[PDB]
């Protein structure tokens, strides 16, 4: 219709919406300041809001409020370790509700001293040499009994040391460390078939993703482990005999039925057919190929 009239009407309603939103925000303010909601016009509401904000008062939140929101969102504890030696430079008090460890067991300690030995090598990989992030999974010791380990997902980044704005006094323990880079990270707790490849000992070295649908484990939860570790004790030597026999009979297929402990710690009957892959030049066994099927 008339382009000038429609422009005018759109503009008038835009200004009307603006006025309405201003009024709504002023009502919110009246709800948010002390003596108001306990009735006042716009000017007194604004003056009381000014006074209340002067009371309350650059970041929108304090450091403590930010930390509170992050930990309320997804738990975790902060640690700052040095890359050359794994030396724990800082640990948050959140390590107590996460690992049931006091802050005192991580200070003067090393990240290698706090993880499972089978993981220490991996740790070095993560500590050697957007924003150069790091994302890994490890096993950390806990309170306890005997040694107690829990899987911990770690998310962090490499930071040039020392950090800006933080005073490093002359007589501080950190004064003679001289570490150049540090890892700053958060640690947080927590009928088909699939193919796989193993070495002649039975260690998972390739795992099809369909493992999740077949036995409930992620591929990372199987790789590196021996298949016999997931097999029923009364089927374990049968499975081992099959693995040792398939090596003697290269090319021939061997089938074996056994109980596989799913991740629900439930026994599932599995039929595994296995054969060897021969190196086409030297005829040596490269690995054992298994098809593992639900029964």
């Amino acid at each position: 219709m008339d382009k000038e009239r429609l422009a005018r009407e759109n503009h008038s309603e835009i200004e009307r919406r603006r006025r309405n939103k201003m009024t709504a925000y002023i009502t919110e303010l009246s709800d948010m300041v002390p003596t108001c909601s306990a009735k006042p016009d716009k000017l007194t509401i604004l003056r009381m809001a000014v006074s209340h904000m002067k009371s309350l008062r650059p970041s929108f939140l304090t450091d403590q409020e930010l930390k509170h929101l992050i930990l309320e969102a997804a738990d975790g504890f902060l640690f700052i370790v040095s890359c050359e030696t794994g030396r724990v430079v800082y640990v948050s008090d959140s390590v107590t509700p996460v690992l049931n460890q006091p802050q005192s067991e991580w200070f003067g300690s090393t990240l290698y001293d706090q993880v499972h030995p089978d993981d220490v090598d991996k740790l070095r990989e993560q500590l050697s040499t957007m924003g150069s992030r790091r994302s890994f999974i490890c096993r950390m010791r806990c309170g306890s009994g005997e040694p107690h380990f829990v899987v911990v997902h770690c998310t962090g980044y490499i930071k040039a040391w020392p950090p800006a704005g933080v005073s490093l006094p002359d007589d501080d323990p950190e004064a003679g460390q001289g570490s150049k880079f540090c890892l700053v990270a958060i640690g947080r707790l927590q009928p088909t078939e699939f193919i796989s490849r193993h070495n002649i000992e039975g260690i998972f070295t390739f795992v099809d993703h369909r493992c999740v649908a077949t036995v409930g484990y992620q591929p990372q939860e199987l790789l590196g482990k021996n298949i016999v570790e997931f097999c029923h004790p009364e089927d374990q030597q049968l499975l081992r005999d099959s693995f040792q026999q398939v090596v003697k009979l290269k090319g021939q297929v061997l089938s074996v039925m056994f109980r596989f402990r799913s991740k629900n710690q439930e026994w599932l009957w599995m039929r595994t057919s296995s054969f060897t892959f021969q190196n086409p030049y030297s005829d040596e066994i490269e690995y054992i190929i298994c098809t593992n099927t639900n029964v």
Binding site: M32, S59, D63, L66, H68, S92, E174, R197, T205, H209
Partner: protein, 327 residues
């Protein structure tokens, strides 16, 4: 003057007083319009009212001055370690809070996002999904959010907790989502310098690597000594490709030339990377001596296309999975 002008001047005076008190740098405050002044003052009051209920240190057997400064920055350190941003959303889908790092990941300013509807940041096709997360307590999902640097798919890991001290009308507190948003992850090494990153490897007759050039070290991630101490290259090859590579190894044994073959190699990161390669036999006194394989890295798209158009059919051709490698 006139009474209308006087009242408007009083209102603007109070609005400027509110603006100067906002906890933002002055360059941010000076660019704020009046509606955003009110919106952010309401934001600050709601935040403070909540923290008054919900909120409130190194162990004294551990306290150094340096550790005390680190403790004073603990929250920022957590935020930087997030690899993402904090989001807190009300039942009314309003952004109760967003950390500053949202600008690092989506390009939105913190002062623009707070106390606006979260759906303005979320893809339409995903908005419904987000709503079902806003209404037994933990949450883990995926949503595509607007990226002004355009969308990025983000993992949201969070929780539903009661947002205290909001003085809704006297209503009880409603559940808000306290989430951390991070980007997604792909498991394949695609070369950025895709063009002519040709690298050559030397191998024994059984394809055990014995030599590698610099571009090979960059692509695969192994040191030369690491590459040669892990058995034959069949330990490096995807299970969906091993039979094809074996056939082409036979072809090379019989004719000295393998021909072009596309397959996946396991990087030191335990990631798969596509390569188009050609393996040639070098001879000593007329007898096979070693192999020289020359490889070009491929994007995942080109690799999938080659696999889709593959010549032979062999078992495990379409299998996908993960691998490891020892010595």
């Amino acid at each position: 003057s006139n009474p209308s002008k006087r009242h408007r001047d009083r209102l603007n005076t109070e609005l400027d007083r509110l603006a100067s008190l906002l906890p933002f740098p002055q360059d941010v405050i000076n660019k704020l319009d009046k509606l955003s002044v009110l919106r952010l003052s309401v934001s600050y009051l709601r935040a403070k009212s909540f923290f008054d209920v919900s909120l409130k240190g190194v162990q004294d057997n551990c306290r150094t001055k340096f550790r005390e400064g680190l403790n004073l920055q603990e929250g920022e350190f957590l935020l930087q370690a997030l690899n993402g941003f904090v989001l807190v959303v009300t039942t009314d889908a309003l952004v109760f809070y967003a950390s500053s790092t949202i600008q690092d990941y989506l390009g939105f300013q913190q002062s623009d996002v707070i106390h606006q509807s979260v759906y303005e940041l979320i893809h339409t096709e995903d908005r419904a999904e987000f709503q079902r997360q806003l209404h037994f307590m933990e949450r883990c999902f995926v949503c595509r959010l607007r990226c002004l640097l355009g969308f990025l798919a983000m993992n949201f890991q969070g929780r539903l907790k009661y947002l205290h001290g909001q003085n809704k009308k006297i209503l009880p507190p409603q559940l808000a989502l306290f989430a951390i948003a991070t980007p997604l992850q792909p498991p394949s090494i695609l070369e950025i310098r895709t063009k002519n990153f040709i690298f050559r490897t030397k191998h024994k007759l059984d394809f055990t690597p014995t030599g590698c050039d610099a571009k090979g070290k960059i692509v695969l991630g192994y040191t030369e000594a690491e590459l040669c101490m892990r058995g034959t290259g069949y330990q490096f090859i995807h299970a969906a490709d091993m039979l094809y590579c074996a056939e082409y190894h036979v072809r090379m044994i019989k004719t000295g030339e393998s021909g072009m073959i596309v397959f996946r190699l396991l990087t030191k990161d335990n990631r798969w990377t596509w390569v188009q390669s050609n393996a040639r036999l070098v001879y000593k006194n007329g007898r096979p001596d070693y192999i020289i394989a020359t490889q070009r890295p491929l994007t995942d798209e080109e690799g999938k296309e080659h696999l889709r158009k593959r010549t032979l059919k062999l078992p495990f051709m379409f299998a996908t999975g993960e691998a490891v490698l020892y010595e």
